[PDB]
Amino acid sequence: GSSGSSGIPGPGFTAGAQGSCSLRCGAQDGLCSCHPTCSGLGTCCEDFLDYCLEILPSSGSMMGGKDFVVQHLKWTDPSGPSSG
Numbered sequence: 139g140s141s142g143s144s145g146i147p148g149p150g151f152t153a154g155a156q157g158s159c160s161l162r163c164g165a166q167d168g169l170c171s172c173h174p175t176c177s178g179l180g181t182c183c184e185d186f187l188d189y190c191l192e193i194l195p196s197s198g199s200m201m202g203g204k205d206f207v208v209q210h211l212k213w214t215d216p217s218g219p220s221s222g
Contacts, residue, residue, distance in 0.1 A: 159183045163190035 157169035163186075165172040170183030174194050183189075 157183050159186040159189045163193045 157167055159165070159170070159172035162172035166175070167181070167183075169181075170176070170186060171179065171181040172183060172186055172190060174190075176182035176186065
């Protein structure tokens with residue numbers, strides 16, 4: 139038997155131009171990320187790969203294998219209207 143509202147507004151930090159992986163290549167940020175998981179998320183830095191283009195773990199090759207194929211199309215049916 140309650141509803142309330144509640145609210146706790148935080149202040150503004152305001153950092154500015156940031157998000158570099160020069161001496162990182164293993165961190166997570168908001169603007170970007172120097173983590174290899176940034177791939178799954180999508181917060182990789184623009185210079186993350188440039189500076190971390192060889193930080194990822196071993197990338198095996200050949201494991202399974204699967205393919206697909208499909209193609210079909212057809213539709214025919216004339217008509218004949220009339221009037222009176």
